[PDB]
Structure 1
Amino acid sequence: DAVFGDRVRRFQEFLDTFTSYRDSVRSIQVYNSNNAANYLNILPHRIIISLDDLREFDRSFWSGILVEPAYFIPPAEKALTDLADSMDDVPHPNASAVSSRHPWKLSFKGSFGAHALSPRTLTAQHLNKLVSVEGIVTKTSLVRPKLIRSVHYAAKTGRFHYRDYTDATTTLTTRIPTPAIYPTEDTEGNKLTTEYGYSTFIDHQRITVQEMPEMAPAGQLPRSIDVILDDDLVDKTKPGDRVNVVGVFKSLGAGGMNQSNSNTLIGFKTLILGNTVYPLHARQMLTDFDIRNINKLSKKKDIFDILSQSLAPSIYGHDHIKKAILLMLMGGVEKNLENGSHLRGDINILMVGDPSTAKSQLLRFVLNTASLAIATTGRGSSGVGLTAAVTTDRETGERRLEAGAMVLADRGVVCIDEFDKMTDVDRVAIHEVMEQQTVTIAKAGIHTTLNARCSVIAAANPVFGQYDVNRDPHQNIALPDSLLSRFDLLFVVTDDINEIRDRSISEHVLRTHRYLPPGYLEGEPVRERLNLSLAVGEQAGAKLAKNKGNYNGTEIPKLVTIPFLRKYVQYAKERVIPQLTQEAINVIVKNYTDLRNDDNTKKSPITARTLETLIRLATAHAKVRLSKTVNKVDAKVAANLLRFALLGE
């Protein structure tokens, strides 16, 4: 009744108190006006409030929002729409666009406290309350438009008529439903023709979010909840992403309370009407002094080996492996020619070696360090289920392709463990994706080519229990040469038994096991923790807090922390696209001609494709030192690394 008006005017007072939101609104309006008829991006009618300020202004209204959003959000949206309308000034508008009546729905950010949950913890007492849940994206439905308000016209009268349709999931408040029957007859029998181009249709997409399996109980499976989002943000993100969504948690549907029940133990449906979505990402931007620090690091003479040694400090030796991983994480550029089709651009590396020499650990470190990565095991995967799947979406009854494992990691990296222990059939699929980086699915009436430009890192065991150094290298490996020649770099690791190295590695390992988390005593085990205090988050150049990276003093050479290294990788993969020159060409061709005719024993035969590997390694090393041109020093280091990886020191 009048409570709506009182809440609306109170919200108007609150909006008038602060000036940031009005500035955002006028910026949106001026951008929209500037994009009208000036020689494609548009800004949706959404503004984000920080309910910390709302709490600091009024506790009653804040509590009403966080306890019963149904009676509080719509008045706020109405007041915001009224303010936007008053600020709006369009003397000469259009005709079909002016009748949109976009209500400017809201988004939230700030500290929630006891209303930030997980998909397992959601239960009955949390219904009808605004919440914010974290999780992983499991699957997404198809974008489908739905109708809201139609427009009719009658030739005789010349009076346009409109009817508005709303459903349970359309609005937060339950109202008497209206069927989708088009009214085509007037009250006096006039004929009414539906007017498309004047009616209202909004997008609709359903997704399902799942709890992260790492934070799971003892011997229990991950669980998932249902999320509906519409209008804007309708197709953000994708399956296999860490997200945090804020929305209203409400129940819908009769659930069998009517005569349609068939058993006593029926239930009800539960569902989330999402308001806003944030990329959790367990942040991705660069500050001014961040760029200054990256530049001052890059201009140093010895950045590359510092970065290499910075990877996984708890693994002893394997320096060349660390360098190879560093070069692989930021590989060379793609080449496409109008006549030459496409050339592969990144690097692939394979590991074969004797048991218990820290290959899986390094692979796990690469998983954690890289931006986008997916973990696969040879015995736990099926080739057909790795690339695509033919499944039928529930709502539409139509069968649509489901993205496979390595397709999700396009442009990323995929790590495979127990590679040689995989079924041979699946192997052929790998060859396909190593041939032209494209997978084709022709089955059940679907013919489509899917892009997959990911890089592969894998480790495999020798045929015997341990590597035999006196035998043919092909004799020690169970994989055919057809796919082994595809891999750019192959490494053989063996634990030579020397008492000096034994003592050194023993000291290192014993140093590792004596570690205590900061701020925690040693008498009790590690416990679970709560999420960050704020559900949503966000003097320069004089502090160098984490810039130098040397967290503790253990060696004269410097070290850098993981976040700074990831920031460096992010900057390098975008801001520089180097080009090679003739001096590196001369060095590379000389080394290739020499290696081709050295005519001595070697781990693997060489062919023309190794020159491509040299080119891409030189490009990657130029990317490392942040130069737009490739100099002969990178050719030298690439040649040295190749000689180490194939000849042996």
Structure 2
Amino acid sequence: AVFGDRVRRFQEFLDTFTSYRDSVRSIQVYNSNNNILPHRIIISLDDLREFDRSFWSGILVEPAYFIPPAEKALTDLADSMDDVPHPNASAVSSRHPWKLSFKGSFGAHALSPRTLTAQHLNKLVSVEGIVTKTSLVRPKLIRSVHYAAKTGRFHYRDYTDATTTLTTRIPTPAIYPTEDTEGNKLTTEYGYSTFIDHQRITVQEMPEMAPAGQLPRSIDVILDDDLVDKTKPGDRVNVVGVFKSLGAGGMNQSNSNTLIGFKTLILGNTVYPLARQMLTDFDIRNINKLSKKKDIFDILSQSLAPSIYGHDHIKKAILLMLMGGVEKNLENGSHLRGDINILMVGDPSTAKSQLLRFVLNTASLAIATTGRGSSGVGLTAAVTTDRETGERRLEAGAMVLADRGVVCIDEFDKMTDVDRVAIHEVMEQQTVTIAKAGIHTTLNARCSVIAAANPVFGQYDVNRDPHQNIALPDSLLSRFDLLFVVTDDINEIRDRSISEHVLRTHRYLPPGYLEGEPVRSLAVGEPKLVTIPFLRKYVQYAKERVIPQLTQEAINVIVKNYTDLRNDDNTKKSPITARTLETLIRLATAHAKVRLSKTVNKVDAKVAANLLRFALLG
């Protein structure tokens, strides 16, 4: 009775707003023309609230009774809209109803894994956090279709589960019917049965937002059908779903615990990424106009870490690393990486850690690790078991997680050789090889490595040769494209400048804050320095839509520079090698990418040579 009234009311709501009808028509037209779009519609809670307050409130506080009616109304509207002449047997037998999706503003239901409490059960909530785990995808049985040869008719059965439907129903064992009502033998029609994908993920509270002295908490989320593979570990997501409770929770006499609560999880409706900034026509035009400037490189380099005084060359190297070179794989099998690795060895208090933090924040994908805080296994991959399935699998490590990204390693010299070996393999081959518990696989690890280290004595000594100063293996050192040695030199002018800069920085106050006040979302769906968001947009554009190709003049410059540097009496902080030629080519390609140029020109070669010369001979 009430169910039909709610269905009719949601039908009226959908009729009033023609945008959803147009979206459904477009999806159906695209599917008919042809890879396929899932039967899902995103509706705005604000429009529903403006239309009917009662329905919006019910959906927010009592989704179990108000969502299925809306889904049925949407399915009926789509079916009435459908005009397919011949429905395929699988289509007729398919159980594919339209699923509703929500956006807008969740006033008090916008929470985090820490703030989810028993008072929010059976309510629509929005959870924001970081994905830490991801179960394997497996199909789930909802409908079974059978055939009786003698009768010549198809019989079907429908299955339900605690997680498949919002409303509780009698449990249904997965035992396939074998016999008809009259005793007729039945044959299972797998091709006509309906299965849907199922996956379980764990969303973790963001560590920065956790209380003082308390470890982050996490909540389990269930994804079905088209939301199965929308996330990977390490992603920041905004999940919308219905907080639910499952099981007896010790109520049953079989559990003697009498002190154990119920199980709880979320049945996800949406997954909203929190990584790629959409580029507008105005943004693209601004990027092009800024790139056309002759000194674009200087401005972009200066815009990185405005609070760090000096270190211009290190900033240029970081920018080139962010832009990255062009990766070429030859037919014979040789693989040439386009990533640029950077190492900084210097005296204490030289802004190495701050630079690492800044590159961690700015880079689209970045993972931070420490020397003493990491392990070989924690870097590569760990063997573990899947709760959902109970299947032996692999868990991505630091290196793996940062594929096509950047990994920042702090205190690089405070590590162990055991741990070092993993890294050595990673940088050398850009792949991870695992041989454990009957697992034989190769993991792609294509990440740029930026690390900071200290001398063995804790202070760089000019008298002693570079080999004695740094204890890291020579083989590991050779993989780094650029090595920067930074020392703290006492000079009156530089000391005064640095002190004034630090004092000016320490006097900053945030907007909307009174003096002496200590430093403490609305919607879900939603020579001048360059602002950081614009820098991110520029980096994304350049790294996505530019692949510079080499030219003859750049080659002449590169070979001239290599010949001059390798056979020169002047000593170098790092030995010259054929890898230096590849480093020069990579830096030239990165500089070409900076200017949004399809070809590498003499300017790029000159800039790369200057940077390499500064890094080598200071």
* Coarse TM-score class (shorter-chain normalised): over 0.9
Separation in 2 of the partners of 1:100 and 1:186?
21
CA shift for structure 1 position 236: 1.1
**Unaligned segments of structure 1, at least 5 residues:** 36-40, 529-533, 539-556
Partner of 2:552: 582
Deviations 1:73-130 (A, max 9, x none): 1111111111111111122221112221321011000011101111111111111111
User: What CA distance in whole angstroms lies between the structure 1 residues aligned with 2:237 and 2:519?
Assistant: 26
Cα deviation for residue 385 of structure 1 reads 2.4
Report what 1:311 is aligned to. 304
Q: Distance in 2 between matches of 1:209 and 1:252?
A: 18
Does the 8 Å contact 2:558/2:581 carry over to 1?
yes
* 2-structure distance, mates of 1:594, 1:218: 57
Q: Deviations over 1:188-219 (max 9, x none)?
A: 22111111101111000001101001011121
Q: Distance in 2 between matches of 1:263 and 1:18?
A: 53
- How much does 1:67 deviate? 1.0
Cα deviations by residue, 1:430-460 (Å, 9 ceiling, x for unpaired): 1111111011001111110111000100010
CA distance in 2, matches of 1:294, 1:625: 10
2:11 is aligned to 12
**Structure-2 separation of matches of 1:379 and 1:166:** 49
Q: What is the DSSP-based 3-state SS (H/G/I as helix, E as strand, rest coil) of the residue aligned with 1:397?
A: coil
Residues 568-627 of structure 1 deviation map (CA, whole Å, 9 limit, x = unaligned): 000000111110111111111111111122122221211111111111111110100111
Range 564-573 or range 583-592, more displaced: 583-592
CA–CA separation in structure 1 for the residues paired with 2:123 and 2:615? 60
Secondary structure in 2 matching 1:350: strand
Distance 2:446 2:312 in 1: 27
Runs of 4+ with >4 A deviation? none
**1:524-569 deviation digits (Å, cap 9, x = unpaired):** 21129xxxxx34244xxxxxxxxxxxxxxxxxx2111000000000
1:570 aligns with 2:564: no
| 8 Å Cα contact 1:132-1:535 kept in structure 2 | no
2-side partners of 1:416 and 1:266: how far apart?
Answer: 42
Which residue in 1 is equivalent to 2:253?
259
Q: What is the CA distance between 1:394 and its match in structure 2?
A: 2.0
C-alpha deviation, 1:159, in angstroms: 1.1
Q: Deviation at 1:336?
A: 0.7
* Superposed displacement of residue 473, structure 1: 0.6
Q: What is the CA deviation profile of residues 385-431 of structure 1, one whole-angstrom value per residue up to 9, with x for unaligned ones?
A: 21111111123222211111110000100001110010111111111
Task: Assess, with a 3 A threshold, how the Cα gap between structure 1 residues 283 and 440 changes in structure 2: closer, same or farther.
Answer: closer
User: What is the distance in 2 between the residues matched to 1:458 and 1:632?
Assistant: 30
Q: Which residue number corresponds to residue 268 of structure 2? A: 274
Cα separation, 2, equivalents of 1:271 and 1:202? 19
Task: Please give the secondary structure, in 1, of the residue aligned with 2:84.
Answer: coil
- SS of equivalent to 1:203: strand
- Does 1:95 find its partner at 2:65? no
Q: Is the 8 A contact 2:95 2:194 kept in 1?
A: no
1:252-300 deviation per Cα after TM superposition (whole angstroms, max 9, x unaligned): 11112121121221211111111111012x8611101111111111111
Structure 2 distance, partners of 1:380, 1:501, is 35
Counterparts of 1:354 and 1:90, CA distance in 2: 73
Deviations 1:113-171 (A, max 9, x none): 10111111111111111101100001000111111111111111101111111112111
CA distance in 1: counterparts of 2:333 and 2:147, whole angstroms: 58
Query: Which stretch shows the higher mean deviation, 260-269 or 463-472?
Result: 260-269
| Paired residues of 2:383 and 2:394 also in contact (CA < 8 A) | yes
Root-mean-square deviation (CA, aligned residues, Å) is: 1.2
Q: Secondary structure at the match of 2:535?
A: helix
1:537 aligns to 2:531 (yes or no): no
Q: How far, CA to CA, are the matches of 2:487 and 2:564 in structure 1?
A: 28
Alpha-carbon distance between aligned partners in 1 of 2:9 and 2:143, rounded to the nearest angstrom: 30
CA distance in structure 2 between the aligned counterparts of 1:327 and 1:395, rounded to whole angstroms: 43
Bigger mean CA offset, 611-620 vs 253-262:
253-262
Larger CA deviation: 265-274 vs 560-569: 265-274
Segment drifting more, 338-347 vs 399-408: 338-347
Report if the CA contact (8 A) 2:200-2:388 is conserved: no
Q: In the alignment, is the contact (CA less than 8 A) between 1:77 and 1:104 conserved in 2?
A: yes
Distance across 1 between alignment mates of 2:80 and 2:586:
59
Structure 2 gaps, min length 5: none
2:556 is paired with a residue of what secondary structure?
helix
Per the TM alignment, residue 482 of structure 1 is displaced from its structure 2 partner at its CA by: 1.0
Conserved 8 A contact 2:431-2:446: yes
Equivalent pairs, count: 618
Which SS does the other structure have where 1:139 is aligned?
strand
1:487-566 residue pairs with structure 2 within 5 A?
487-527=480-520, 534-538=522-526, 557-566=527-536
Q: Is the 8 A contact 1:107 1:276 kept in 2?
A: yes
Shift of 1:34: 0.4
Identity of aligned residues (%): 100
| Corresponding residue of 1:548 | none
Please report how far the alpha carbon of residue 384 of structure 1 lies from its aligned counterpart in structure 2 after TM superposition: 2.1
Q: Distance in 2 between matches of 1:373 and 1:252?
A: 37
1:347 aligns to what?
340
Shift of 1:340: 4.3
CA distance in 2, matches of 1:284, 1:594: 43
| Equivalent pair of 1:184/1:191 in contact (CA under 8 Å) | yes
- Larger fraction in helix: 2
TM-score, normalising length from structure 1? 0.94
Q: Structure 1 residues 359-368 or 264-273, which shifts more?
A: 264-273
Moved more, 92-101 or 45-54: 92-101
Q: Distance in 2 between matches of 1:316 and 1:263?
A: 62
Contact in 2 for aligned 1:210/1:225 (Cα 8 Å): yes
2:388 equivalent in structure 1: 395
Distance 1:365 1:27 in 2: 44
Contact 1:11 1:79 in 2 (8 A): yes
Instruction: Note closer, same or farther for the CA distance 1:283–1:338 as it changes in structure 2 (3 Å cut).
Output: closer
Superimposed CA distance per residue, residues 8-30 of structure 1 (whole angstroms, 9 cap, x where no aligned partner): 11111111111111110111111
> How far apart are the structure 1 equivalents of 2:525 and 2:83?
34
Contact persistence 1:420–1:461 (CA under 8 A) = yes
CA deviation map 1:502-521 (0-9, x unaligned): 11111111111111101110
Q: What is the CA–CA distance in structure 1 between the aligned matches of 2:276 and 2:595, rounded to whole Å?
A: 23
SS at match of 1:15: helix
* C-alpha contact (below 8 Å) 2:95/2:143 kept by paired residues: no
Asked if the contact 2:327–2:337 (Cα under 8 Å) also holds between the matched residues in 1, the reply is yes
Please say if residues 581 and 629 of structure 1, whose CA atoms lie closer than 8 Å, have aligned partners that are also in contact: yes
Q: 1:106 aligns with which of 97, 100, 106?
A: 100
Query: How far apart are 1:352 and its partner, in Å?
Result: 0.4
SS in 2 for 1:352: strand
The whole-number CA distance in structure 2 between the counterparts of 1:634 and 1:114 is 54
- Helix, strand or coil at the partner of 1:450: strand
Distance 1:647 1:176 in 2: 77
* Conservation of the 8 A alpha-carbon contact between 1:352 and 1:462: yes
SS at match of 1:237: coil
CA distance in 2, matches of 1:372, 1:435: 21
3-state DSSP of counterpart to 1:96? helix
Q: Distance in 2 between matches of 1:87 and 1:367?
A: 50
Deviation for aligned residue 1:183: 1.6
Q: Distance in 2 between matches of 1:98 and 1:156?
A: 22
- Partner SS for 1:232: helix
Post-superposition shift, 1:356? Answer: 0.9
Partner of 2:450: 457
